[PDB]
Write a protein that binds this ligand. Structure first.
Ligand SMILES: C[C@@H](c1ccc([N+](=O)[O-])cc1)n1c(=O)oc2ccc(S(N)(=O)=O)cc21
Ligand SMILES: [Zn+2]
Length: 257
């Protein structure tokens, strides 16, 4: 099955998921000089004060912090979006080295990691229905660079020892995702896809201009996770990123000049 290795990595995904070669695949390189400022874009509305985190799970490809999405508790609105998108989970993609790890790139520059806060359009009733719709998901993408520690990330880092291997989960209540946000909510936006199989073309991507900084110790702890299950041969969970895909007939819009 699919993964990030030599024999099952992103270049192989199209054999099981032909949409991998589709018209609105993600991630992409954000060429900052050719992105178009759109003054009709609204400021993002990130309403996370009532967020209810539940658990953290190693799914064999990343780790997901999952939220109660049965009510409008943590929602994303505004920006390019119509309607209300509920936060369901966040996860990261990261590298084996500080110079790689992000999925989106900025003028071909790769960041050490990329955070994806995944939201679904409440008009579709549940996440499973939303992924079947062209406007079903909104993913807020935030780049991570290595520098000073991010205090709001530390509670995530400290639980990773409990979910080292695929299939492990741990309780993870009362986590506040506002501690993962940069100061500015300036963003680029474009229509795209899930970056992992099934690669469905259901995502309005909103990628923040301002990265967050995390410490070397914080990212090193990401790199100690395992793709494998307990008792299977150990393979470090690193480089779980898909490279940039062709932009094709899309224009990236910017909320800022
Ligand atoms: C694809 C997925 C499939 C299977 C697993 N899994 O559990 O192994 C995880 C994600 N997937 C999913 O189902 O819901 C998602 C939400 C977001 C993203 S991302 N990287 O674009 O923000 C991918 C997926
Ligand atoms: Zn992702």
């Amino acid at each position: 099955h699919w993964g990030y290795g030599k024999h099952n990595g992103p270049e192989h995904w199209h054999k099981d998921f032909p949409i991998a070669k589709g018209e609105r695949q993600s991630p992409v390189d954000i060429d900052t000089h050719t992105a178009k400022y759109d003054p009709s874009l609204k400021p993002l509305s990130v309403s996370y004060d009532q967020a209810t985190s539940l658990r953290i799970l190693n799914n064999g490809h990343a780790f997901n912090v999952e939220f109660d999405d049965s009510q409008d508790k943590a929602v994303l609105k505004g920006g390019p979006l119509d309607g209300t998108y509920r936060l369901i989970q966040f996860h990261f993609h990261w590298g084996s080295l500080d110079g790689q790890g992000s999925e989106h790139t900025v003028d071909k520059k790769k960041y050490a990691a990329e955070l994806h806060l995944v939201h679904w359009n409440t008009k579709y009733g549940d996440f499973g229905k939303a992924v079947q719709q062209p406007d079903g998901l909104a993913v807020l993408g935030i780049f991570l660079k290595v520098g000073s520690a991010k205090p709001g990330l530390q509670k995530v880092v400290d639980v990773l020892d409990s979910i080292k291997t695929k299939g492990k989960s741990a309780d993870f209540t009362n986590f506040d995702p506002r501690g993962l946000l940069p100061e500015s909510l300036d963003y680029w936006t474009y229509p795209g896809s899930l970056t992992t199989p099934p690669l469905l073309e259901c995502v309005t991507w909103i990628v923040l201009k301002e990265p967050i900084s995390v410490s070397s110790e914080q990212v090193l702890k990401f790199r100690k996770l395992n793709f494998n299950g307990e008792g299977e041969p150990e393979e470090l969970m690193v480089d779980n990123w898909r490279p940039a895909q062709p932009l094709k007939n899309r224009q990236i819009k910017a909320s800022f000049k």
